[PDB]
Amino acid sequence: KVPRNQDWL
Amino acid sequence: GPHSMRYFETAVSRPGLEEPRYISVGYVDNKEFVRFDSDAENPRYEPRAPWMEQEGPEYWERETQKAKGQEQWFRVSLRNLLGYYNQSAGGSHTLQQMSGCDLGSDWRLLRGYLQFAYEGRDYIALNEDLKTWTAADMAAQITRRKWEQSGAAEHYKAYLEGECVEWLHRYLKNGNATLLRTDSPKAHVTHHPRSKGEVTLRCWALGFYPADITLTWQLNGEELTQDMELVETRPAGDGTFQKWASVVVPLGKEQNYTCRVYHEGLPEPLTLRWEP
């Protein structure tokens, strides 16, 4: 199951 | 044994006002198992190993929805980076991410990974503690501060210690045979002319899986490292791998040399020689 990223770079 | 899962994500920006292309590939024990590509006619996460067919419509719908969110996250991030580095818009630029976990035989996380690269160079990475960040760049220090303020490390740690490990385990159970199969190398030595009075002996190992292998030559049982050429291991294209190692030998003395092949699929290492 893929991660979901949090804040943008 | 020492199992892993990785998702490798790439976004590439395009000339004009075109949208980036986004590709995400997932790996269990280093074999691709799922893929998403925004260039596809109906972009969706799709199985890439037959044992992934077990998962129902909901799994795929949710993975796809996450991919679509990642696609936008990469779009915005690319734009942000263009700012940090004072780069001109409408160029070609790449952003990559690797994430995932290594599991032990007791099913505990041994190590978690979450790292990014811009233009193929390290940008920012979560340290092994899963708590702090290493930034490679002055620009990446902006990201690091932003992510220390937002508590991003905790978010990724929670994914790495929970979902990553738990789903990897499920995938290992589901791909029972497939994932654990090794293919032993088949080996043979070939013989080729070379300069005056010397010949090349080349020890080949074919049809093997996993990629990890060691090839050695000996002269009368003594090792050879001096004067051994060997190629990078390379895919046959059918899921197995190939490698060879060669030495240059006096004409007539070919029977003095012995090739040894070490692979984990072998009941024990192969020893072979030039057989005319």
């Binding site: - | 790439t10 590439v12 790449t94 390379r234």
Partner: protein, 99 residues
């Protein structure tokens, strides 16, 4: 335009003249991921060349396997020609049936 491709050209099976096989051109260590690869028989472009999907390695560099059915013979020459931003001109590497 930073990392220059390394190339290996080789058959899937040990080559036997007259027997159908598959020629591979494995290209690695390159960045950016956009690359153009052509496989050539006697200097002419081979039409039905397959390419593996975009992948990258743990060092961030990309790799690709181009492949085509072929039947080796005593005299036909095969090669893989690669165009990439990191090189001033295309790199051609010929199949050596011994490697």
């Amino acid at each position: 335009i930073q990392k220059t491709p390394q190339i290996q050209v080789y058959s899937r099976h040990p080559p036997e003249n007259g027997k159908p096989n598959i020629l591979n051109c494995y290209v690695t260590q390159f960045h950016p991921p956009h690359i153009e690869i052509q496989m050539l028989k006697n200097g002419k472009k081979i039409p039905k060349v397959e390419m593996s999907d975009m992948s990258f390695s743990k060092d961030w560099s990309f790799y690709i396997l181009a492949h085509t059915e072929f039947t080796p013979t005593e005299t036909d020459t095969y090669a893989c020609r690669v165009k990439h931003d990191s090189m001033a001109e295309p790199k051609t590497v010929y199949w050596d049936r011994d490697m």
